Design a protein around this ligand. Structure first.
Ligand code: NA
Length: 373
């Protein structure tokens, strides 16, 4: 009578190409588990989750996102304030991350978890520990691999709706945006640039090896590696703009369960919609040239416009132009099989607790840009 206990419930893992198509339109739970304040030490998970003014996340938020047409949630996570001297993540924090992931997959949406403000631009008391610098890579490889082994072990038994992302926006020691060494004297330093791409590629290898080495489902889980700075290669204003794309090396052994991620915050202010569509076409063309055309699917894991964080956003100042940009950006991405994840907005702050969209018009616009006939 206990024979169904021997049942092996085999878990299929789709290709990353199909995963990225099936994600539909996504959203970022930003400024939440990624929030951090280097001047503080936490004693509860709530202090971390709420330190940038977002509420403690509840499952109803994701029911609302799903019903509005979203198919995937990126859950950025910052780990360094949750790690001891040896790099061990405390159990309470890992349990909380798992709760939020559960909230997402309960809606049959995809969920991406990453390593977020462990990377990024130094500022005041904040100095990111993961840097696109080969000396930093050599120094921190062991700790970074241990972090990914821990995350991978915690999430090993989840099916293919859960994806892992190696690192967020890793910069050189000069905190260069756009391309490695842009912030150097003369806007280039070949020594720094070469070091930076070696480090990106090393961290990418370390991530894949650490995750796949934990075995089981993690041998086939769909994994995501980001370019230098999550830069997207667009533009012709400097001859190095494509280097984050062309200098990325896909780790050995990867083929059917690997994706590449970039971020995009195009400028629309001061432009006509025709020019904006052309800019988006140029962005997508580069992603096609270096990745999609070679069978490497791409995720635009954060997007909005360049004024997303400005005192006057494009949503306020030029809403219709922004919506025309949304329509075309989502459509051009969809035609290439590239998934997009909008950065914050939509349901923000106390609105998430209701739950309610404080940008209902934009949420609907994004969903209809993908699903509407
Ligand atoms: Na603590």
């Amino acid at each position: 009578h206990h024979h169904h206990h021997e049942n092996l419930y085999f878990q299929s893992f789709e290709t990353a190409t199909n995963a990225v198509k099936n994600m539909g339109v996504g959203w970022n739970l930003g400024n939440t588990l990624d929030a951090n304040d280097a001047t503080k030490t936490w004693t509860t998970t709530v202090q971390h989750e709420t330190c940038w003014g977002q509420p403690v996340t509840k499952p109803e938020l994701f029911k609302m996102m799903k019903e509005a047409g979203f198919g995937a949630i990126r859950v950025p996570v910052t780990w360094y304030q949750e790690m001891d001297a040896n790099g061990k993540v405390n159990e309470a924090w890992m349990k909380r991350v798992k709760e939020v992931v559960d909230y997402v997959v309960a809606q049959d949406m995809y969920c991406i978890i990453n390593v977020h403000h462990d990377t990024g631009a130094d500022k005041d008391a904040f100095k990111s520990w993961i840097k696109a610098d080969e000396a930093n890579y050599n120094q921190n490889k062991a700790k970074y691999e241990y972090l990914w082994r821990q995350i991978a072990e915690a999430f090993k038994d989840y099916g293919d709706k859960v994806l892992f992302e190696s690192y967020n926006e890793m910069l050189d020691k000069l905190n260069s945006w756009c391309f490695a060494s842009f912030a150097a004297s003369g806007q280039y330093d070949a020594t720094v640039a070469t070091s930076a791409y070696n480090a990106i590629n090393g961290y990418a290898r370390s991530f894949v090896n650490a995750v796949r080495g934990t075995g089981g489902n993690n041998v086939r889980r769909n994994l995501i590696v980001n370019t230098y700075a999550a830069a997207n290669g667009s533009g012709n204003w400097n001859a190095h703009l494509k280097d984050p794309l062309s200098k990325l090396v896909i780790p050995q052994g990867e083929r059917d369960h690997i994706a590449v991620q970039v971020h995009a915050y195009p400028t629309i202010a001061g432009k006509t919609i025709s020019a904006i569509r052309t800019d988006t076409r140029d962005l997508m063309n580069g992603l096609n040239t270096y990745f999609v055309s070679k069978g490497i699917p791409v995720i635009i894991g954060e997007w909005s416009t360049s004024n997303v964080d400005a005192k006057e956003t494009d949503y306020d100042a030029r809403k219709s132009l922004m919506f025309q940009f949304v329509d075309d950006f989502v459509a051009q991405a969809k035609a290439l099989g590239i998934a997009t994840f909008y950065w914050m907005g939509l349901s923000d702050g106390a609105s998430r607790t209701m739950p309610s969209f404080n940008q209902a018009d934009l949420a609907e616009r994004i969903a209809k840009a993908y699903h509407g006939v």
